[PDB]
Amino acid sequence: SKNVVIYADGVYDMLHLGHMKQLEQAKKLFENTTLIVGVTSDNETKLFKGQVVQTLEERTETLKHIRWVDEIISPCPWVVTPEFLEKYKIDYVAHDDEDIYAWLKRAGKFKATQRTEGVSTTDLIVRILKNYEDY
């Protein structure tokens, strides 16, 4: 019955049904939740992961439309810290999958969510291209 604060982070570039279902899963981990979503910065995403198609402001403006999202931290830190969870009063971190998150699991704050295959924005474009026979 008590409200529980859930945190999920990510790039959310070219937002698709796969992202949305993962956000839904985080939102519904418990009966009464606040879902905070962290959106990674342009510079850190590009440095550590890869080039982003959409700027931070665009990625965040799109997430704002998703039913499950209660609060957005934009930009969020690239690495989650215990101090960050205390500052935002976060009870659990929802995420995929030396295990950079061993400390979240040891703390009881790790909640796994699943990715959906085949539904990404690039997947849709691949379906378009497959309409043109190569020969």
What residue ranges bind a copy of itself (CB under 8 A)? 14, 17, 20-21, 23-24, 51, 53-54, 58, 61-62, 65-69, 119, 121, 124-125, 127-128, 131
| Region from 9-17, 67-75, 112-120, 124-132 binding ligand Cc1cc(CN)no1, contact rule CB under 6 A | 9-17
- Count, residues near ligand Cc1cc(CN)no1 per rule CB under 6 A: 13
- Interatomic CA distance for residues 70 and 27, integer angstroms: 9
- Interatomic CA distance for residues 102 and 85, integer angstroms: 15
**Is residue 42 a contact partner of residue 78, using CB atoms and an 8 Å limit?**
no
Contact between 40 and ligand Cc1cc(CN)no1 per CB under 6 A: yes
Instruction: Determine if residue 85 is left, alpha or beta; phi over 0 gives left, psi from -120 to 50 gives alpha, anything else beta.
Output: alpha
**Is residue 60 a contact partner of residue 90, using CB atoms and an 8 Å limit?**
no
CB 134 → ligand Cc1cc(CN)no1: shortest distance, Å? 32
Q: Could you tell me which residues are annotated as the binding site? A: 11-12, 19, 49, 96, 116
Instruction: Determine if residue 14 is left, alpha or beta; phi over 0 gives left, psi from -120 to 50 gives alpha, anything else beta.
Output: left
| Partner touching 20 among ligand Cc1cc(CN)no1, a copy of itself, none, CB below 5 to 8 Å by kind | a copy of itself
CB 10 → ligand Cc1cc(CN)no1: shortest distance, Å? 5
